[PDB]
Symmetry: C2
Subunit: 351 residues, 2 copies
């Protein structure tokens, strides 16, 4: 009651606590109080709980067996604020998602089935579907292997992840304005939602090249003020209402690729620069690369073929996105690599 | 083998992983590799393990039943470096120590004995003894209660802690120079070890008042260069050898008390300012307050009586130290309040 079984995992480049739904209070307010206490929030240092004093390590997954047709488990993502008594069920960023498949198997929501085991995951926050393929050699999840992702030392078991029903996850449409491009504060942008609502505009159009490192971007007050005025201006158009204290849309500043990739991106999510790029924001940006004349179309190098592999270059490397594009040109699925690791398993306590 | 039972606790204003000795490899090199992997080191973000990406949350306690006369458990403290593949068994700072008593009781090294339970702890790093009194109402440790310590939100069960055999823990003598005061780079200082080797000098003597906040102190390059030249100059005198890449001695800049206390301290440990003060450094400073004409004697207000309560004021509050002083004037024991909390219990995993 003042404890719950819990597995602490790294999912992608994030970390947090993974629960079975039936182990947390049914009452939302009771649930949030418990998770705040588990993390040690509110406290800039989160010294009296399991948060790592950074929003990326103050995250929670709630997983349960699904009754939806074709779905194996339902997954609710929760952000536990570091220094506010606030838990939000914001848009999925796609990193904590990576631990969901392995966690479900370990907890018996899904039994191991051969040496690899498919987990079909409904993302309750947005209504999207992720199919994760996880290594279960011998009938037990493994986290060891040869996969790498930027921002994570060494190598782990690959978890290839295929996203469906991304389109208009949050905005109700791929293009909530109905336009490929909209002029906003005199600038051409794309308002797009293929898994994450994004505003996609050229880095050069807001006075940077798009190749600056994260620290310089975080210190560029005039850049931040400029794109933030754009974000606040488009919230209604994107069916997002007043975005002032919202986490969306992500601001995606695109420049031509430099390392032979598809596109270069600097992401503000919305107010600080992402060290890499969010998974679902990569899908939105890779999709915008395909819409003609659009800011991202103008900078991107897009390969021919129905199965398009788009290497999205970011501050510290690149994240590769495989778009499967039907003969009508819409994106039918996006596949991206994740990794995760079980770090501690047992019981968490609150006062 | 690639896991161990482990309890994650907050101890004082630090956090880390608590093990039974018999659950870790006997081989030191094997042990260090395992603990590095457990924390997610080396990695500035410690994203692939249980470290909180700060040295204060990248700490380990190793506890076992003691055979020493009068000792209940042996405790070895280990610092797991955040971004280096290095584990050190440095001097005890006294915060992780606070979880040792409760952990021993929970693991059955010591059985609960009534509603409060004494744990006599040998600190293997330095040879000191700490007696911790822990609440065991009903025969089970509790972490709830009305105690507070600066740097930890809310309140917890008190763990009153009494230190003995502090004198010359590391230096072999209370005063390794044999002098109450030594002139170093033209400045009077006290080289003292009553639980933590410290250099004690007046804040004013190095060009600050001693009331500056931590951020200003951390940014004072000329202050840091000045006291660091002092530290490097005294390492041999204190029987510490070449202190260049050492963590000791702590630099303690004392000023007259301002909130009715005994003394005001700003601590460099050795290169960044402490947010409060270390427990054992408080004992060393409180002891130096009693040695006549000495820098700390000149600034301190010392109360009459054989049981002296010295409120050591620090950046974010004060830490109170009860010295029990025998008729010969030496310190016979120092008592200080700690708190701890069990945060997660179960098993930790490495690849
Ligand atoms: Cl459940
Ligand atoms: Cl936060
Ligand atoms: Cl997610
Ligand atoms: Cl043991
Ligand atoms: Cl470190
Ligand atoms: Cl300690």
């Amino acid at each position: 009651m003042d404890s719950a079984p819990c597995m602490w995992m790294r999912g992608g480049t994030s970390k947090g606590g993974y629960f079975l739904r039936a182990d947390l209070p049914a009452d939302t307010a009771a649930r949030d109080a418990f998770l705040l206490a588990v993390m040690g929030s509110p406290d800039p240092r989160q010294i009296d709980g399991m948060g790592g004093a950074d929003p990326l390590t103050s995250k929670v997954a709630v997983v349960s067996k699904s009754e939806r047709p074709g779905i194996d488990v339902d997954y609710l993502f929760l952000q536990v604020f570091v220094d506010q008594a606030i838990v939000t069920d914001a848009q999925n960023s796609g990193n904590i998602l990576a631990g969901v498949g392995p966690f479900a198997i370990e907890r018996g929501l899904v039994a191991a089935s051969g040496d690899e085991t498919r987990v079909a995951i409904f993302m309750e926050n947005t209504g999207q579907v992720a199919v994760a393929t996880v290594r279960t050699p011998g009938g037990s999840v493994t986290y060891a292997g040869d996969a790498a992702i930027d921002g994570v030392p060494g190598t782990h078991a690959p978890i290839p992840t295929e996203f469906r029903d991304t389109a208009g996850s949050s905005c109700g449409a791929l293009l909530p304005s109905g336009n490929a491009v909209d002029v906003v504060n005199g600038l051409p942008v794309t308002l797009i939602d293929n898994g994450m609502p994004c505003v996609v505009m050229k880095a050069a159009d807001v006075g940077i090249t798009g190749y600056e490192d994260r620290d310089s971007l975080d210190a560029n007050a005039e850049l931040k003020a400029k794109i933030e005025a754009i974000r606040l201006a488009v919230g209604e158009l994107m069916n997002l209402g007043d975005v002032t204290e919202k986490s969306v849309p992500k601001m995606m500043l695109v420049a031509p690729p430099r390392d032979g990739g598809a596109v270069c991106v600097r992401s503000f999510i919305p107010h600080r620069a992402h060290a890499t790029i969010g998974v679902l924001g990569a899908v939105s940006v890779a999709t915008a690369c395909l819409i003609p004349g659009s800011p991202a179309a103008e900078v991107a190098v897009v390969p021919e073929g129905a199965r398009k592999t788009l290497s999205i270059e970011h501050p510290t490397g690149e994240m590769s996105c495989v778009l499967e594009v039907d003969d009508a040109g819409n994106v039918v699925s996006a596949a991206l690599l994740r990794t995760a690791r079980k770090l501690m398993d047992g019981v968490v306590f609150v006062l």
